[PDB]
Design a protein around this ligand. Sequence first.
Ligand SMILES: Nc1ncnc2c1ncn2[C@@H]1O[C@H](COP(=O)(O)O)[C@@H](O)[C@H]1O
Ligand SMILES: Nc1ncnc2c1ncn2[C@@H]1O[C@H](COP(=O)(O)O)[C@@H](O)[C@H]1O
Ligand SMILES: [Cl-]
Ligand SMILES: [Cl-]
Length: 249
Amino acid sequence: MTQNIKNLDLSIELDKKMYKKKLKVLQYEMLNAQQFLLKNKIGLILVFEGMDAAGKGGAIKRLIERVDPRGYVVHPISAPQPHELRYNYLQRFWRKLPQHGQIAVFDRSWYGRVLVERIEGFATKDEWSRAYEEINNFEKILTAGDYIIIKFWLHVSDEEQLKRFKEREQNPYKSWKLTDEDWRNREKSPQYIEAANEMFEKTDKKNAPWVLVAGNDKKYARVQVLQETLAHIEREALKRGLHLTNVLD
Ligand SMILES: Nc1ncnc2c1ncn2[C@@H]1O[C@H](COP(=O)(O)O)[C@@H](O)[C@H]1O
Ligand SMILES: Nc1ncnc2c1ncn2[C@@H]1O[C@H](COP(=O)(O)O)[C@@H](O)[C@H]1O
Ligand SMILES: [Cl-]
Ligand SMILES: [Cl-]
């Protein structure tokens, strides 16, 4: 589970002060990576998926906290509006792609086509069934050009998610947003997990990988999201005959 994703990193868990130092180093490196991508006119597209309260929002917050806000947009993706349904389901995401050298973060994304839309029946069986290759072909158009794509799935246990739901229910900034329907959707988690697993099997590609993040521990998840983003940027840079260096100071 969470232990298996943690057993992929041979490094140890850190106490709080050391976590804070490691986070600060990784955030400086992410800022440097952004300036490198801007200078070399390579776009970056980061996808985040996972159940409610898996920690997508907080992981994103630490990822871009020290990045220049001129160079990124975080898109919180919800259900399509009536105007968006007058086009193909990818249109609303095509519209949001960053320029060469810019960063776009998708907190939920086009993979909704094979997740919530499959689970709730909003997509027919033909639609979600053909969407895996549709999505691979879309991502491959971009990664054959001047874009790097990384997709993150934040795993969380039912138990840890329930703990977080109860925290939110007691939080003045968050209780207003937690509804009875959010609690009822917890009953659909087995089907969501099956759908996510088929998604991994069919759309985990060498140019657009799925990274499974152990989300039960938020501090570990933030560090892992940063490390994996940096590792993949460095490898794709090398594949392009570029070497990531310090371009800040
Ligand atoms: N592509 C999508 N198709 C259908 N429902 C979606 C899609 N993306 C997100 N949703 C749902 O839209 C709602 C958005 O609410 P929130 O994200 O809390 O603003 C949630 O119930 C999501 O599960
Ligand atoms: N609408 C709700 N508001 C608050 N807690 C809920 C709600 N629905 C379910 N729960 C919680 O879900 C857990 C299981 O309850 P139940 O699903 O009713 O067996 C308990 O911890 C409940 O407090
Ligand atoms: Cl269409
Ligand atoms: Cl808080």
